[PDB]
């Protein structure tokens, strides 16, 4: 428990990830690391008991301590309300945290050499900038009960005017309606973060919109990205022999699918949410991806796993059946969190520990110890046997040995 | 001595697609088929001159004649406004036409046994039912100039009282804001058509939504599907050993990517638009996909090609250089329409011809004659020799020649 890590905000999750989260702290972290740990329990029961307040407290605690790591959480619908006897259908804690902090969420696969892909031609990593603010996460949606008029209006703060837009007039029957929004300054921050990540990896930058369909809404993103690139980034982009280009999401997803990778993909909030699942599965597992929210201050960071609570695996866990569930994405939330913490504190010891754990996971997988998903990439699902993989505990305990070995060997040098 | 086809509505496109469209008419359709043809030119320059009225006329024609076929068109942005010197930025004819007719757009890849997929496991078709109505096509978006309150309001027709919801309060600077909607009845028709397609093809049906995030908007789609499923189609699904399941869009796309295919995928408007282009490309080309708008009446269809105008190739075609562009989607637009035109009139010849032009198009590619896109699928693009592919004109000729042979052989 020797390395002094400093202050880190921990957010505990639900279901299968919450079990993995506890195995991670016990086996891979607390033995080697002493942290000043501000822990917020985001499990569904404690959010219900606090009326979601713990979610907001955790977000403000991240603002203060500059780093947080988040386990995956249940976002309840009607069935979850009935399952846990909830008071309300609470909003996504991810959406709540992301809209307080702001910024961009970068998502990238975690690449092992022995792991085949689903998409043949990606030999270089694709990196998704996902705008983290506004759009669907922040939307206001409601059921339209019957005939009537749906309008969306804008009143300036002074208000010396009112601009009223017709959304729809429902002549017979009901339906649904929603408003949504984004902010210029958040878009600008989203652009600056996308361009800088391009130059940081030396790669070109594709931004995708619908702007032919939404002309004002998506046109604003295209305009903001083009103005900033023209004025600020263009000379720098040319000198590295890369470029920035806008593409319609239709073409963009087709291009991304047939390309070789090796590009930064700046997506709007909804697209990045959906495409990072497709991308991560293309490289062969949702268990292998990193998701790191980088805030506009260049200082505060929130790392997480981008996949969910793996309910189906949890259900087998509750019956005593063996599970094989991929912890790697969760482990990398900690390593991405501890590495940014070392950067802020100039802690070489912690920075070394974070990198070593990432290598141990990849080495352990490249050396043939893996969960069932990754073995299914190798053999195909119908060909995998029980002897072909390790259960969730066997795999954590294996990484435990290899992490002890790697840190022991390093102590002699 | 031509087959009499009946009445078809034609909508003509722009750029590269408009060239291929004219090729298919002269070399493929016209010699063998006589048609009562109502031609509406949807080219961007005409839409400007008719103030887009040409597009509403074409849709009403589709209601009247039940059959239409469409070449891809330009939906202008500010750049296109400069290029064509447009009066306004016209909305998408595809959205305009879809929102008049209503329905589910059904999309599926065209499979030639010799063409490798980018995605390893899909050995069976993925058919995406795409809701054609509302959502992003009908949205009202505007620029927020500066600080202030954006609100969404519902005023009932019975005069009870107004509900006003706060969208956002901008306390510094501006942004963008938009409203959007959908209609219960349209969702019900989208549900019914998805359950029927799953039963006729015998495959499981998945619906994908965001319902954990939009709890009302997407919760409605999910409630309606589940209601109609249990009360109407449930016991027929169980009789065919297939199921209906709702999935979060996140989980769904990963489930589709790692599956072997063989399912019906019900998507909301935007999702169906994008996922259909990722799915076509996973099968190896945007050039082979069928897109049919199937209207709720069980009668009218509009057949199109889901891809765009292929502008990049059009710029090369304008340079006189060799363009290889895959006609297949535009051809299958005509055949899917004509097969429907034949199903209505019980015209057995036009039905034989429609399957012939599809059977020919697949055999020409499975014999080694293909456009560059499909050649890159086999050898990879850096390995593609000029000897591997025929250009746009060369390819449409090999089809017309194999078409002449296949129809000549069955006259007997
Ligand atoms: N970041 C977040 O906090 C976040 C994000 C998404 C979803 N969620 C929540 O998670 C809950 C469940 O959502 P969901 O069932 O739609 O999606 P999910 O549980 O995340 O994933 C569904 C399927 O994806 C596969 N999978 C995902 N991660 C895996 C891993 N690490 N190792 C092995 N397999 C993995 C499993 O495949 P197989 O079934 O094929 O074995 C799993 O059954 C919901 O309450 C949702 O709100 C939270
Ligand atoms: N149905 C419609 O009316 C429809 C649908 C979508 C877009 N559009 C319109 O089309 C215009 C341009 O769209 P866009 O530039 O975004 O994309 P696009 O025209 O659809 O095509 C862009 C890329 O897709 C590939 N591609 C698509 N179809 C192909 C084919 N048949 N054969 C060979 N390659 C093909 C090409 O890839 P490579 O460059 O790599 O060779 C091409 O550069 C826009 O104005 C848009 O509004 C119309
Ligand atoms: O918070 C949720 O409910 C979904 C979050 C998610 O899917 C993501 O982070 O990509
Ligand atoms: O009409 C447009 O502008 C795009 C249409 C499209 O890409 C589609 O519906 O597949
Ligand atoms: Ca996601
Ligand atoms: Ca499309």
Tab-separated table of N, CA, C and O in Angstrom, chain A residues 368-405:
chain	number	residue	atom	x	y	z
A	368	UNK	N	-2.413	-15.666	-23.664
A	368	UNK	CA	-3.405	-16.716	-23.784
A	368	UNK	C	-4.341	-16.904	-22.612
A	368	UNK	O	-5.103	-17.879	-22.605
A	369	UNK	N	-4.312	-16.016	-21.623
A	369	UNK	CA	-5.248	-16.055	-20.505
A	369	UNK	C	-6.296	-14.964	-20.722
A	369	UNK	O	-5.962	-13.774	-20.758
A	370	UNK	N	-7.554	-15.369	-20.885
A	370	UNK	CA	-8.575	-14.440	-21.355
A	370	UNK	C	-9.948	-14.876	-20.866
A	370	UNK	O	-10.156	-16.027	-20.469
A	371	UNK	N	-10.894	-13.938	-20.919
A	371	UNK	CA	-12.281	-14.275	-20.649
A	371	UNK	C	-12.944	-14.818	-21.918
A	371	UNK	O	-12.367	-14.810	-23.010
A	372	UNK	N	-14.207	-15.236	-21.776
A	372	UNK	CA	-14.866	-16.010	-22.826
A	372	UNK	C	-15.057	-15.199	-24.100
A	372	UNK	O	-14.893	-15.731	-25.203
A	373	UNK	N	-15.401	-13.910	-23.969
A	373	UNK	CA	-15.563	-13.055	-25.144
A	373	UNK	C	-14.323	-13.086	-26.034
A	373	UNK	O	-14.419	-13.326	-27.242
A	374	UNK	N	-13.145	-12.851	-25.452
A	374	UNK	CA	-11.931	-12.782	-26.260
A	374	UNK	C	-11.585	-14.134	-26.872
A	374	UNK	O	-11.148	-14.200	-28.025
A	375	UNK	N	-11.791	-15.222	-26.124
A	375	UNK	CA	-11.619	-16.552	-26.696
A	375	UNK	C	-12.579	-16.792	-27.849
A	375	UNK	O	-12.238	-17.505	-28.804
A	376	UNK	N	-13.778	-16.202	-27.777
A	376	UNK	CA	-14.754	-16.337	-28.848
A	376	UNK	C	-14.298	-15.621	-30.106
A	376	UNK	O	-14.683	-16.014	-31.212
A	377	UNK	N	-13.489	-14.568	-29.967
A	377	UNK	CA	-12.887	-13.977	-31.156
A	377	UNK	C	-11.953	-14.973	-31.833
A	377	UNK	O	-11.890	-15.040	-33.067
A	378	UNK	N	-11.203	-15.739	-31.036
A	378	UNK	CA	-10.237	-16.689	-31.585
A	378	UNK	C	-10.936	-17.891	-32.225
A	378	UNK	O	-10.685	-18.217	-33.391
A	379	UNK	N	-11.799	-18.585	-31.472
A	379	UNK	CA	-12.392	-19.827	-31.967
A	379	UNK	C	-13.751	-19.662	-32.647
A	379	UNK	O	-14.196	-20.594	-33.329
A	380	UNK	N	-14.407	-18.509	-32.515
A	380	UNK	CA	-15.830	-18.425	-32.811
A	380	UNK	C	-16.623	-18.883	-31.601
A	380	UNK	O	-16.148	-19.742	-30.852
A	381	UNK	N	-17.840	-18.372	-31.413
A	381	UNK	CA	-18.608	-18.746	-30.225
A	381	UNK	C	-18.965	-20.227	-30.154
A	381	UNK	O	-18.760	-20.836	-29.088
A	382	UNK	N	-19.492	-20.866	-31.205
A	382	UNK	CA	-19.870	-22.287	-31.070
A	382	UNK	C	-18.695	-23.221	-30.824
A	382	UNK	O	-18.911	-24.342	-30.347
A	383	UNK	N	-17.466	-22.799	-31.123
A	383	UNK	CA	-16.284	-23.643	-30.962
A	383	UNK	C	-15.592	-23.486	-29.609
A	383	UNK	O	-14.687	-24.270	-29.300
A	384	UNK	N	-15.988	-22.508	-28.799
A	384	UNK	CA	-15.312	-22.259	-27.531
A	384	UNK	C	-15.767	-23.301	-26.519
A	384	UNK	O	-16.938	-23.701	-26.501
A	385	UNK	N	-14.833	-23.772	-25.699
A	385	UNK	CA	-15.103	-24.725	-24.636
A	385	UNK	C	-14.841	-24.020	-23.312
A	385	UNK	O	-14.273	-22.924	-23.277
A	386	UNK	N	-15.163	-24.693	-22.204
A	386	UNK	CA	-14.892	-24.073	-20.909
A	386	UNK	C	-13.398	-23.981	-20.651
A	386	UNK	O	-12.933	-23.000	-20.056
A	387	UNK	N	-12.635	-24.972	-21.124
A	387	UNK	CA	-11.187	-24.993	-20.968
A	387	UNK	C	-10.483	-23.884	-21.744
A	387	UNK	O	-9.285	-23.667	-21.519
A	388	UNK	N	-11.190	-23.172	-22.630
A	388	UNK	CA	-10.578	-22.161	-23.489
A	388	UNK	C	-10.419	-20.796	-22.821
A	388	UNK	O	-9.769	-19.917	-23.401
A	389	UNK	N	-11.000	-20.580	-21.642
A	389	UNK	CA	-10.982	-19.258	-21.028
A	389	UNK	C	-10.970	-19.401	-19.510
A	389	UNK	O	-11.071	-20.505	-18.967
A	390	UNK	N	-10.891	-18.264	-18.826
A	390	UNK	CA	-10.972	-18.188	-17.375
A	390	UNK	C	-12.257	-17.477	-16.962
A	390	UNK	O	-12.757	-16.599	-17.672
A	391	UNK	N	-12.784	-17.838	-15.793
A	391	UNK	CA	-13.940	-17.114	-15.287
A	391	UNK	C	-13.502	-15.728	-14.803
A	391	UNK	O	-12.313	-15.396	-14.797
A	392	UNK	N	-14.465	-14.909	-14.364
A	392	UNK	CA	-14.122	-13.534	-14.003
A	392	UNK	C	-13.107	-13.490	-12.863
A	392	UNK	O	-12.193	-12.655	-12.868
A	393	UNK	N	-13.242	-14.390	-11.885
A	393	UNK	CA	-12.308	-14.398	-10.763
A	393	UNK	C	-10.952	-14.970	-11.170
A	393	UNK	O	-9.905	-14.403	-10.837
A	394	UNK	N	-10.948	-16.095	-11.893
A	394	UNK	CA	-9.683	-16.653	-12.366
A	394	UNK	C	-8.875	-15.612	-13.135
A	394	UNK	O	-7.646	-15.553	-13.011
A	395	UNK	N	-9.556	-14.748	-13.902
A	395	UNK	CA	-8.844	-13.770	-14.720
A	395	UNK	C	-8.303	-12.619	-13.878
A	395	UNK	O	-7.169	-12.172	-14.099
A	396	UNK	N	-9.087	-12.138	-12.904
A	396	UNK	CA	-8.576	-11.135	-11.973
A	396	UNK	C	-7.400	-11.688	-11.179
A	396	UNK	O	-6.388	-11.004	-10.987
A	397	UNK	N	-7.524	-12.925	-10.686
A	397	UNK	CA	-6.447	-13.509	-9.894
A	397	UNK	C	-5.203	-13.742	-10.744
A	397	UNK	O	-4.082	-13.634	-10.235
A	398	UNK	N	-5.378	-14.049	-12.034
A	398	UNK	CA	-4.232	-14.203	-12.923
A	398	UNK	C	-3.497	-12.879	-13.091
A	398	UNK	O	-2.275	-12.807	-12.910
A	399	UNK	N	-4.236	-11.817	-13.427
A	399	UNK	CA	-3.639	-10.489	-13.492
A	399	UNK	C	-3.040	-10.086	-12.154
A	399	UNK	O	-2.115	-9.269	-12.113
A	400	UNK	N	-3.570	-10.628	-11.051
A	400	UNK	CA	-2.980	-10.366	-9.749
A	400	UNK	C	-1.563	-10.893	-9.650
A	400	UNK	O	-0.646	-10.173	-9.243
A	401	UNK	N	-1.363	-12.162	-10.024
A	401	UNK	CA	-0.016	-12.726	-10.045
A	401	UNK	C	0.898	-11.897	-10.932
A	401	UNK	O	1.956	-11.428	-10.499
A	402	UNK	N	0.486	-11.694	-12.185
A	402	UNK	CA	1.342	-11.024	-13.154
A	402	UNK	C	1.628	-9.578	-12.764
A	402	UNK	O	2.681	-9.038	-13.126
A	403	UNK	N	0.719	-8.941	-12.014
A	403	UNK	CA	0.971	-7.581	-11.535
A	403	UNK	C	1.969	-7.579	-10.382
A	403	UNK	O	2.833	-6.694	-10.299
A	404	UNK	N	1.848	-8.555	-9.476
A	404	UNK	CA	2.832	-8.720	-8.411
A	404	UNK	C	4.212	-9.005	-8.991
A	404	UNK	O	5.209	-8.415	-8.559
A	405	UNK	N	4.280	-9.886	-9.992
A	405	UNK	CA	5.554	-10.230	-10.620
A	405	UNK	C	6.176	-9.001	-11.279
A	405	UNK	O	7.361	-8.704	-11.087
